[PDB]
């Protein structure tokens, strides 16, 4: 791509008012299919992660997390390199949306979100918590490198990704684990699941999750 829209706000501004899959032209001149939410909170949100049904396996390698994986019509991880490139310029606010098995929605908002490069293991650079009924469960993870089952960078004597079955900016191990193993009900819940500590707490998973930037 020579050029095209740099982000979902630009798309909205030019009259793309329906949420859905669009192409962004990234700073290096590469076109990237992304999901834009044009409707929630004024719209213009780049949805980079979504859990909905357990249809997609989230227990994936460093390379899969780097490049992205999943299905456009359901669950996906956009990819760490994409997120690093997107967030190299500009301030992007993070909105996390969580929905439990009862359909109760709760949200968390952080002022900025940025990923460092692969050399720094896509370390998370997270702004301060602004508001959210779900509470703050990502602050712990700021300043921490990403780890996967084949790339242990956490602060644990073991590999947190293996132990807890996911991929995240693990410490030893987490306050949030949104890329963790899917569970279709509280009865099928895993020891460590799609957890938000300040929300429903560790071991008490959610039914739907999105992470998104604007
Ligand atoms: C071993 C450890 O794993 C994570 O950090 C959980 O949040 C709490 C705990 O059980
Ligand atoms: Ca370790």
XYZ file of N, CA and C in Angstrom, residues 5-205:
603
model
N -5.893 4.656 4.883
C -6.152 5.155 6.232
C -5.142 4.659 7.244
N -4.693 5.533 8.126
C -3.737 5.112 9.136
C -4.380 4.392 10.344
N -5.698 4.533 10.515
C -6.364 4.021 11.711
C -7.880 4.072 11.572
N -8.605 3.562 12.566
C -10.068 3.457 12.453
C -10.788 4.807 12.573
N -10.174 5.739 13.283
C -10.707 7.101 13.379
C -10.751 7.771 12.013
N -9.696 7.604 11.235
C -9.674 8.152 9.889
C -10.734 7.529 8.988
N -10.918 6.215 9.105
C -11.932 5.538 8.333
C -13.309 6.115 8.658
N -13.600 6.243 9.949
C -14.881 6.775 10.376
C -15.081 8.176 9.790
N -14.056 9.011 9.914
C -14.098 10.398 9.427
C -14.395 10.523 7.946
N -14.114 9.470 7.190
C -14.304 9.500 5.755
C -15.593 8.789 5.364
N -16.377 8.434 6.379
C -17.725 7.943 6.159
C -17.916 6.444 6.253
N -16.908 5.711 6.717
C -17.086 4.283 6.992
C -17.663 4.143 8.390
N -18.985 4.114 8.456
C -19.675 4.167 9.728
C -20.130 2.801 10.246
N -19.891 1.731 9.479
C -20.268 0.401 9.925
C -19.059 -0.379 10.471
N -19.172 -0.912 11.682
C -18.073 -1.705 12.224
C -17.785 -2.866 11.283
N -16.527 -3.252 11.156
C -16.264 -4.445 10.358
C -14.812 -4.459 9.912
N -14.503 -5.299 8.934
C -13.082 -5.490 8.559
C -12.686 -4.480 7.501
N -11.623 -3.727 7.773
C -11.101 -2.714 6.851
C -9.590 -2.902 6.708
N -8.981 -2.194 5.772
C -7.519 -2.249 5.628
C -6.934 -0.941 6.089
N -5.905 -1.043 6.921
C -5.125 0.103 7.319
C -3.849 -0.005 6.530
N -3.252 1.135 6.226
C -1.942 1.167 5.614
C -0.984 1.538 6.737
N -0.091 0.613 7.088
C 0.836 0.823 8.201
C 2.003 1.701 7.780
N 2.719 2.289 8.764
C 3.825 3.220 8.520
C 4.890 2.685 7.562
N 5.128 1.375 7.556
C 6.125 0.791 6.654
C 5.567 0.541 5.252
N 4.297 0.871 5.040
C 3.713 0.707 3.721
C 3.164 -0.681 3.480
N 2.724 -1.342 4.547
C 2.103 -2.654 4.439
C 0.622 -2.546 4.807
N -0.252 -3.200 4.050
C -1.692 -3.120 4.317
C -2.094 -4.201 5.292
N -2.922 -3.833 6.268
C -3.295 -4.758 7.311
C -4.805 -4.757 7.503
N -5.435 -5.923 7.345
C -6.873 -6.080 7.649
C -7.072 -5.949 9.145
N -7.975 -5.066 9.591
C -8.242 -4.900 11.014
C -9.750 -4.776 11.168
N -10.218 -5.128 12.355
C -11.606 -4.904 12.715
C -11.784 -3.528 13.393
N -12.584 -2.669 12.771
C -12.882 -1.351 13.339
C -14.265 -1.344 13.972
N -14.354 -0.901 15.222
C -15.660 -0.752 15.860
C -15.985 0.717 15.694
N -17.003 0.988 14.873
C -17.375 2.360 14.509
C -18.512 2.872 15.381
N -18.957 2.019 16.290
C -20.199 2.250 17.008
C -19.986 2.471 18.511
N -19.201 1.639 19.172
C -19.080 1.822 20.614
C -18.255 3.047 21.028
N -18.774 3.779 22.017
C -18.140 4.962 22.603
C -17.674 6.030 21.614
N -18.471 6.270 20.583
C -18.133 7.259 19.571
C -17.497 6.619 18.347
N -17.072 5.369 18.498
C -16.490 4.644 17.398
C -15.030 4.985 17.134
N -14.428 4.257 16.198
C -13.063 4.509 15.752
C -12.053 3.623 16.465
N -12.544 2.511 17.016
C -11.730 1.591 17.819
C -11.200 0.445 16.988
N -9.913 0.167 17.175
C -9.246 -0.935 16.526
C -9.304 -2.130 17.445
N -10.073 -3.138 17.062
C -10.224 -4.292 17.918
C -9.105 -5.279 17.596
N -8.182 -5.493 18.544
C -7.006 -6.352 18.266
C -7.050 -7.719 18.925
N -8.047 -7.940 19.765
C -8.211 -9.230 20.401
C -9.704 -9.408 20.697
N -10.172 -10.637 20.556
C -11.563 -10.949 20.771
C -11.650 -12.414 21.134
N -12.387 -12.713 22.204
C -12.772 -14.071 22.589
C -14.288 -14.122 22.602
N -14.862 -15.217 22.110
C -16.324 -15.293 21.936
C -16.866 -16.710 22.190
N -16.120 -17.745 21.807
C -16.730 -19.084 21.798
C -15.789 -20.264 21.994
N -14.500 -19.992 22.115
C -13.525 -21.055 22.235
C -13.229 -21.753 20.917
N -13.621 -21.142 19.802
C -13.431 -21.803 18.513
C -11.967 -21.779 18.090
N -11.199 -20.824 18.620
C -9.801 -20.671 18.217
C -8.846 -21.044 19.352
N -7.769 -21.777 19.048
C -6.783 -22.159 20.067
C -5.854 -21.006 20.372
N -5.860 -20.539 21.618
C -5.005 -19.408 21.967
C -3.645 -19.808 22.539
N -3.449 -21.105 22.755
C -2.177 -21.580 23.295
C -1.140 -21.699 22.173
N -0.539 -20.582 21.772
C 0.276 -20.559 20.555
C 1.693 -20.050 20.781
N 2.543 -20.273 19.789
C 3.958 -20.007 19.890
C 4.291 -18.521 19.790
N 5.567 -18.211 20.001
C 6.063 -16.865 19.832
C 5.741 -16.348 18.433
N 5.997 -17.178 17.408
C 5.825 -16.698 16.032
C 4.356 -16.418 15.722
N 3.460 -17.258 16.228
C 2.016 -17.063 16.008
C 1.511 -15.797 16.685
N 1.926 -15.575 17.934
C 1.625 -14.285 18.590
C 2.250 -13.077 17.899
N 3.450 -13.236 17.366
C 4.083 -12.163 16.622
C 3.267 -11.804 15.374
N 2.845 -12.826 14.621
C 2.213 -12.584 13.305
C 0.704 -12.427 13.353
N 0.096 -12.900 14.431
C -1.368 -12.891 14.548
C -1.954 -14.224 14.094
N -3.172 -14.508 14.539
C -3.871 -15.776 14.266
C -5.358 -15.703 14.643
N -6.130 -16.675 14.138
C -7.556 -16.726 14.391
C -8.423 -16.490 13.165
N -9.702 -16.222 13.383
C -10.630 -16.070 12.265
C -11.372 -14.747 12.332
N -11.331 -14.026 11.220
C -12.035 -12.764 11.079
C -13.493 -12.787 11.569
N -14.188 -13.899 11.411
C -15.598 -13.898 11.804
C -15.809 -14.258 13.273
N -14.722 -14.564 13.979
C -14.821 -14.845 15.396
C -13.615 -14.349 16.164
N -12.893 -15.276 16.795
C -11.804 -14.938 17.708
C -10.468 -14.749 17.003
N -9.653 -13.812 17.507
C -8.362 -13.552 16.891
C -7.418 -12.802 17.838
N -6.131 -12.848 17.494
C -5.100 -12.004 18.054
C -4.468 -11.347 16.812
N -4.486 -10.016 16.737
C -4.059 -9.286 15.536
C -2.558 -9.499 15.227
N -1.751 -9.644 16.279
C -0.302 -9.913 16.130
C 0.520 -8.830 16.795
N 1.536 -9.245 17.541
C 2.401 -8.335 18.274
C 3.197 -7.370 17.419
N 3.690 -7.848 16.275
C 4.458 -6.992 15.363
C 3.552 -5.926 14.782
N 2.344 -6.319 14.385
C 1.321 -5.324 13.980
C 1.040 -4.286 15.068
N 0.838 -4.742 16.296
C 0.583 -3.818 17.403
C 1.786 -2.923 17.686
N 2.999 -3.495 17.660
C 4.216 -2.691 17.773
C 4.258 -1.636 16.688
N 4.016 -2.023 15.440
C 4.078 -1.034 14.343
C 2.985 0.031 14.438
N 1.759 -0.397 14.735
C 0.674 0.549 14.920
C 0.996 1.570 15.994
N 1.570 1.109 17.091
C 1.697 1.952 18.271
C 3.033 2.696 18.353
N 3.831 2.610 17.287
C 5.136 3.297 17.224
C 4.911 4.807 17.272
N 3.835 5.248 16.629
C 3.475 6.669 16.589
C 2.096 6.890 17.204
N 1.852 8.090 17.718
C 0.530 8.426 18.241
C 0.245 7.878 19.628
N -0.767 8.427 20.273
C -1.216 7.896 21.544
C -2.479 7.091 21.269
N -2.505 5.860 21.757
C -3.626 4.965 21.552
C -4.156 4.541 22.914
N -5.418 4.842 23.207
C -6.000 4.428 24.476
C -6.463 2.991 24.397
N -6.358 2.273 25.508
C -6.746 0.874 25.549
C -8.103 0.762 26.227
N -9.045 0.112 25.558
C -10.315 -0.296 26.186
C -10.425 -1.807 26.180
N -10.624 -2.380 27.363
C -10.882 -3.805 27.564
C -12.377 -3.973 27.890
N -13.039 -4.894 27.195
C -14.449 -5.160 27.441
C -14.608 -6.603 27.841
N -15.337 -6.830 28.929
C -15.492 -8.170 29.481
C -16.972 -8.453 29.682
N -17.386 -9.671 29.367
C -18.783 -10.057 29.548
C -18.804 -11.419 30.190
N -19.488 -11.534 31.319
C -19.546 -12.819 31.996
C -20.697 -13.657 31.471
N -20.824 -14.849 32.036
C -21.784 -15.834 31.558
C -23.222 -15.412 31.823
N -23.399 -14.391 32.656
C -24.716 -13.809 32.865
C -25.041 -12.692 31.890
N -24.035 -12.218 31.165
C -24.230 -11.132 30.218
C -23.961 -9.760 30.818
N -23.434 -9.732 32.040
C -23.029 -8.482 32.681
C -21.740 -7.974 32.030
N -21.782 -6.764 31.490
C -20.599 -6.192 30.872
C -19.854 -5.285 31.837
N -18.532 -5.313 31.750
C -17.697 -4.433 32.565
C -16.496 -4.058 31.717
N -15.897 -2.902 32.006
C -14.868 -2.319 31.138
C -13.728 -1.683 31.926
N -12.562 -1.573 31.285
C -11.382 -0.969 31.890
C -10.702 -0.142 30.814
N -10.248 1.059 31.185
C -9.692 2.032 30.247
C -8.341 2.537 30.745
N -7.324 2.453 29.884
C -5.969 2.948 30.193
C -5.579 4.013 29.180
N -4.903 5.072 29.643
C -4.644 6.269 28.822
C -3.869 5.993 27.523
N -2.840 5.151 27.594
C -2.045 4.832 26.406
C -1.683 3.352 26.396
N -1.419 2.816 25.210
C -0.955 1.444 25.084
C 0.038 1.389 23.937
N 1.175 0.769 24.216
C 2.239 0.648 23.231
C 2.971 -0.660 23.467
N 3.419 -1.305 22.396
C 4.294 -2.470 22.537
C 5.687 -2.123 22.009
N 6.722 -2.482 22.769
C 8.092 -2.330 22.258
C 8.300 -3.372 21.191
N 9.505 -3.396 20.607
C 9.811 -4.247 19.452
C 10.137 -5.666 19.855
N 10.391 -6.526 18.872
C 10.655 -7.932 19.195
C 11.947 -8.099 19.991
N 12.928 -7.221 19.750
C 14.204 -7.262 20.494
C 13.951 -7.173 22.001
N 12.940 -6.394 22.377
C 12.523 -6.291 23.775
C 11.324 -7.168 24.070
N 11.140 -8.222 23.278
C 10.068 -9.193 23.530
C 8.679 -8.541 23.604
N 8.444 -7.549 22.762
C 7.125 -6.874 22.728
C 6.683 -6.425 24.123
N 7.648 -5.915 24.882
C 7.359 -5.419 26.225
C 6.180 -4.453 26.202
N 5.303 -4.566 27.195
C 4.125 -3.698 27.308
C 4.463 -2.357 27.927
N 4.074 -1.275 27.256
C 4.163 0.083 27.816
C 2.736 0.637 27.975
N 2.241 0.630 29.207
C 0.841 0.897 29.475
C 0.687 2.191 30.270
N -0.214 3.051 29.802
C -0.564 4.297 30.493
C -1.353 4.034 31.758
N -1.733 5.102 32.450
C -2.434 4.924 33.720
C -3.915 4.603 33.524
N -4.460 3.864 34.477
C -5.857 3.495 34.515
C -6.720 4.741 34.666
N -7.711 4.902 33.793
C -8.594 6.054 33.917
C -9.888 5.657 34.602
N -10.676 4.783 33.985
C -11.916 4.316 34.635
C -12.266 2.901 34.213
N -13.098 2.245 35.005
C -13.575 0.935 34.612
C -14.179 0.132 35.724
N -15.419 -0.281 35.496
C -16.155 -1.115 36.421
C -15.412 -2.425 36.687
N -14.563 -2.849 35.753
C -13.882 -4.110 35.927
C -12.653 -3.964 36.838
N -12.239 -2.734 37.087
C -11.045 -2.507 37.882
C -9.769 -2.712 37.080
N -8.643 -2.465 37.729
C -7.355 -2.444 37.061
C -6.645 -3.749 37.294
N -6.512 -4.531 36.235
C -5.780 -5.775 36.339
C -4.636 -5.891 35.332
N -4.288 -4.776 34.687
C -3.211 -4.781 33.708
C -1.973 -3.997 34.163
N -2.128 -3.122 35.150
C -1.006 -2.301 35.609
C 0.210 -3.103 36.030
N -0.034 -4.142 36.818
C 1.005 -5.089 37.168
C 1.852 -5.443 35.945
N 1.214 -5.567 34.789
C 1.888 -6.126 33.627
C 2.676 -5.135 32.803
N 2.508 -3.843 33.093
C 3.273 -2.825 32.406
C 4.755 -3.024 32.680
N 5.566 -2.784 31.677
C 7.004 -2.935 31.822
C 7.510 -4.362 31.693
N 6.614 -5.292 31.397
C 6.950 -6.717 31.352
C 6.978 -7.241 29.921
N 7.914 -8.154 29.634
C 8.045 -8.710 28.292
C 6.914 -9.714 28.054
N 6.621 -9.996 26.799
C 5.587 -10.977 26.495
C 6.227 -12.338 26.639
N 5.508 -13.329 27.187
C 6.013 -14.713 27.089
C 5.021 -15.741 26.565
N 5.574 -16.759 25.898
C 4.799 -17.848 25.265
C 5.432 -19.171 25.701
N 4.809 -20.300 25.386
C 5.378 -21.587 25.819
C 6.795 -21.852 25.274
N 7.171 -21.203 24.178
C 8.494 -21.460 23.610
C 9.409 -20.262 23.782
N 8.952 -19.280 24.549
C 9.723 -18.066 24.797
C 9.428 -17.533 26.196
N 10.142 -18.060 27.189
C 9.913 -17.682 28.571
C 10.728 -16.450 28.952
N 10.043 -15.347 29.224
C 10.724 -14.106 29.558
C 10.208 -13.560 30.874
N 9.388 -14.343 31.557
C 8.695 -13.817 32.708
C 9.640 -13.758 33.914
N 9.079 -13.527 35.098
C 9.879 -13.368 36.298
C 9.692 -14.593 37.174
N 9.208 -15.676 36.579
C 8.988 -16.906 37.317
C 10.112 -17.902 37.127
N 10.263 -18.801 38.092
C 11.228 -19.891 37.992
C 10.764 -20.931 36.981
N 9.503 -20.846 36.608
C 8.976 -21.708 35.569
C 8.497 -20.841 34.401
N 7.830 -21.495 33.457
C 7.288 -20.837 32.292
C 5.785 -20.652 32.481
N 5.404 -19.407 32.782
C 4.037 -19.039 33.159
C 2.980 -19.352 32.107
N 3.384 -19.257 30.846
C 2.532 -19.545 29.708
C 2.114 -21.004 29.741
N 3.084 -21.883 29.956
C 2.791 -23.305 30.124
C 1.922 -23.504 31.367
N 2.431 -23.098 32.532
C 1.700 -23.274 33.800
C 0.229 -22.858 33.680
N -0.026 -21.693 33.092
C -1.381 -21.139 33.074
C -2.085 -21.265 31.703
N -1.377 -21.812 30.712
C -1.936 -22.109 29.385
C -2.363 -20.879 28.575
N -1.430 -19.993 28.274
C -1.785 -18.827 27.480
C -0.552 -18.123 27.026
N -0.699 -16.820 26.822
C 0.412 -15.975 26.411
C 0.057 -14.583 26.891
N 1.022 -13.931 27.529
C 0.774 -12.637 28.135
C 2.092 -12.034 28.572
N 2.004 -10.812 29.090
C 3.169 -10.121 29.603
C 3.316 -10.612 31.035
N 3.586 -11.908 31.181
C 3.566 -12.548 32.498
C 4.569 -11.981 33.485
N 4.172 -11.996 34.749
C 5.085 -11.731 35.853
C 5.424 -13.088 36.480
N 4.660 -13.464 37.492
C 4.737 -14.805 38.051
C 3.507 -15.113 38.884
N 2.317 -15.139 38.265
C 2.177 -14.991 36.801
C 1.335 -13.827 36.271
N 0.146 -13.617 36.833
C -0.705 -12.552 36.310
C -1.801 -12.014 37.231
N -2.334 -10.860 36.830
C -3.563 -10.308 37.374
C -4.649 -10.404 36.280
N -4.219 -10.516 35.011
C -5.126 -10.737 33.865
C -4.521 -11.777 32.924
N -5.382 -12.466 32.185
C -4.946 -13.585 31.349
C -5.945 -13.757 30.203
N -6.189 -12.684 29.461
C -7.279 -12.670 28.473
C -7.061 -13.578 27.239
N -5.833 -14.046 27.055
C -5.491 -14.953 25.981
C -5.441 -16.373 26.534
N -5.967 -16.542 27.741
C -5.952 -17.857 28.389
C -7.021 -18.790 27.841
N -7.103 -19.988 28.408
C -7.915 -21.051 27.851
C -9.413 -20.820 27.970
N -10.132 -21.065 26.884
C -11.558 -20.808 26.875
C -12.345 -21.843 27.671
N -13.427 -21.387 28.286
C -14.314 -22.259 29.045
C -15.737 -21.813 28.791
N -16.610 -22.769 28.464
C -17.972 -22.444 28.039
C -18.943 -22.150 29.186
N -18.570 -22.523 30.407
C -19.342 -22.147 31.594
C -18.457 -22.102 32.839
N -18.985 -21.537 33.921
C -18.295 -21.523 35.217
C -18.020 -22.933 35.745
N -18.798 -23.921 35.293
C -18.585 -25.310 35.709
C -17.428 -25.954 34.954
N -17.169 -25.475 33.739
C -16.038 -25.978 32.965
C -14.798 -25.112 33.165
N -14.901 -24.143 34.068
C -13.811 -23.218 34.367
C -12.502 -23.912 34.716
N -11.398 -23.342 34.229
C -10.055 -23.852 34.504
C -9.433 -23.161 35.708
N -8.421 -23.795 36.287
C -7.706 -23.213 37.409
C -7.285 -21.790 37.039
N -6.643 -21.651 35.886
C -6.337 -20.348 35.336
C -7.029 -20.233 33.976
N -7.933 -19.263 33.828
C -8.684 -19.069 32.576
C -8.581 -17.656 32.017
N -9.657 -17.201 31.381
C -9.772 -15.851 30.834
C -10.192 -14.961 31.996
N -9.203 -14.627 32.817
C -9.417 -14.057 34.129
C -9.057 -12.567 34.132
N -9.793 -11.801 34.936
C -9.468 -10.397 35.256
C -9.493 -10.246 36.800
N -8.331 -10.180 37.453
C -8.316 -10.325 38.929
C -9.240 -9.347 39.674
N -9.175 -8.065 39.328
C -9.965 -7.045 39.996
C -11.438 -7.136 39.632
N -11.755 -7.935 38.617
C -13.140 -8.137 38.226
C -13.706 -9.310 38.989
N -13.786 -10.460 38.336
C -14.359 -11.639 38.968
C -13.290 -12.479 39.643
N -12.026 -12.082 39.517
C -10.943 -12.786 40.195
C -10.391 -13.993 39.469
N -9.216 -14.452 39.898
C -8.543 -15.578 39.255
C -9.387 -16.837 39.391
N -9.485 -17.612 38.318
C -10.272 -18.844 38.342
C -11.735 -18.646 37.990
N -12.133 -17.393 37.782
C -13.518 -17.064 37.453
C -13.598 -16.340 36.094
N -13.683 -17.138 35.013
C -13.495 -16.704 33.622
C -14.642 -15.891 33.065
